[model samples]
Target chain A: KEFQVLFVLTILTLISGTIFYSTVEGLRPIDALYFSVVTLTTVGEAPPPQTDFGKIFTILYIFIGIGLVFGFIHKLAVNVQLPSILSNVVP
Target chain B: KEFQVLFVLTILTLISGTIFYSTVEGLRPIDALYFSVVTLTTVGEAPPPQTDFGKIFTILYIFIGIGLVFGFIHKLAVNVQLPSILSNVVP
Candidate 1:
């Protein structure tokens, strides 16, 4: 499944996105990081990126971000066990 | 490190949180799930829970939820490799 590989890739994606926004949009580091995570999780509470480049980046971000998170979540789902009592009952 | 175990635990926590809110607060399933994910990631755009128990549960959720996420992310960080060219340079 290359589980850890995909997770690392996703982290890199978020980090790079944060750096991009911070550089291009004049966002503070914390704000950029927060925006990146918010966008990735698709909760998106932070204001949208303002500039043309920033907006374009966000468009790309939207395409990739959710997929990356869900990809990691999919890796996690491989061996998902029910709660212990429920586990015993099912097992 | 029981990576999958911890990942599953986090997922269960989210699912349980969603179901709890859904049942207790009369939120639609989608809304409840969104609330749970938002709370878990700390994006938290959803309206505050109205009931005392729901609010208390959120307080508890705030404590454990982020830890669970970071725990899973930490597990994934164990084998994080740089991108291919960067990997070769570092290696």
Candidate 2:
């Protein structure tokens, strides 16, 4: 299903981001995961990327990750809420 | 169409955010607009909201605006790219 695909892709993107930031930025795994989450959520509480490559990677990462994460959320809302509402209305 | 609705919603959300931050955060209109774009894109380039209310507003704003902005982008990619690609292949 589309939902499953989005979910997997979102997780994969997050993991990849986490690994890259941890390795390249010299951040701990927890901090790297935090960065990835904040960036994807657009909350942006974590510190900005310092290195030139980190900044560039962050830009590309955000562009790709935002869609996957938000798409999963969108699909989740539709799958979870819409079907329940539709079922009640149609019956 | 869904695309038009998403486009309008995206613009409205950005405009509302710009106005709110300019008034509440005392930022210039240009700066507020910059803040709005950066926040929605998750680039976080502009300075973080300083006021307590500004911070709160930004949290809600990002949650709502991210979906609209990215949804618009998704629809855009589908509309602009899919049809052209399909046209070539289906013929």
Candidate 3:
């Protein structure tokens, strides 16, 4: 039950990010999706956004999206009944 | 108690990232510190590392450090007794 809530939010954020970047930045859909995942994961493998709005939007997006992604992962660890080493490290 | 444990781990990760980037990537200490924050925050503001090893380390670093940073923030929100709007979004 708890997992579903976060999962929904995470997916929504990912979809929003993909659409925004694809439309606003004129990136291909797949590239935009790749960028969204890279941004949320903090891997930062892609170059930073170029447009003023794209840059600003990315700032706010990261603040919200990163937490949701990691929180979802943390909950997933809990749900799977992982060993203490993984679960205990977070919350 | 819970907050502090995550806090310590977060700091340690940040420090280690800063030191590693500075030493391995040959970035200035301040630049290294800034890169570390940029990486952990998932902001992607800084350009990625140039060296092959730096790239590899950053991949692992993001996998570990992003979780720690967001987990720390999640705990921070909990500890400060933020309104439900913020706290309820994550685990």
Candidate 4:
């Protein structure tokens, strides 16, 4: 299941999200992945990608990643609510 | 569902967030989409791109991208969270 999910994610990120990351965001491949991992995990380590591509990666990643993970949770049976301020506070 | 999410993300990235970088993340069309694909899948690599646009792309992408996926998780269930860390760390 996750294999497929991941596959889909990678595909989307590559064609769209990753493109944004590299071109618009100005992120290296790794940096783009770095940004994606940090964001998807909800970890606040990233300072936000700096370029157009980075932002593109960031936006699309959030939309899709959030949907993938959260929706998975929703399918399983969990109620997740993040405190908006927490991210700011932590990072 | 994933398709809808991806579509929404691409549209958003193209519109709002992808615009921030002065340099703008300059991924080729393929690369932009490619980065988006990679990021959402949650691969962690960081070479940090070297462009203003790239960084900008990284940032905003994180913001909304995070919001959507995380929120979606809250709504659905079962993110890519690991057995131990996901429940503990994510919670």
Give the TM-scores of the predictions, in the order they appear.
0.48, 0.54, 0.54, 0.35
Two-way DockQ contest, 3 vs 4, winner: 3
lDDT of 1 by residue, B3-76 (tens): 66677877898889889999998898889888888877767686666665776576556544655666667676
Cα lDDT, model 4, residue A91: 50
Kindly state the fnat score of candidate 4.
Answer: 0.05
Per-residue lDDT of A36 in model 4: 59
In model 3, what is the error at residue A19, expressed in angstroms? Answer: 1.4
- What lDDT tens digits, residue by residue, belong to model 2 across residues A1-91? 6687668777888899899999999999999988988887778876666665676677667655775677678888899778988888984
lDDT per residue (tens digit) for residues B5-81 in model 4: 75465457544432433225654554455454344334323345578656666766766575564444443333333
lDDT of 1 by residue, A1-91 (tens): 4767876887798789879988999976656666676566555645667899999999888797778766665554443322442475554
Q: Considering only chain B, what TM-score does candidate 1 achieve?
A: 0.74
> What value does the lDDT take at residue A26 in candidate 3?
97
Considering the two chains of model 3, state its CAPRI-style docking category. Answer: incorrect
Model 1, position B4, has a per-residue lDDT of 65
Top candidate, metric DockQ:
3
DockQ-based CAPRI category assigned to the predicted complex of candidate 4: incorrect
Candidate DockQ scores, in order: 0.09, 0.18, 0.21, 0.08
Model 4 interface DockQ: 0.08
Compare candidates 1 and 3 on lDDT and give the better one.
3
Once superposed on the true structure, which residue ranges of model 2 sit more than 4 Å away at CA? A81-91, B1-72, B75-91
* Residue B68 shift from truth in candidate 2, angstroms: 12
Q: What is the interface RMSD of each candidate, in Å?
A: 8.0, 4.6, 4.4, 8.1
By DockQ thresholds, what CAPRI class is model 1?
incorrect
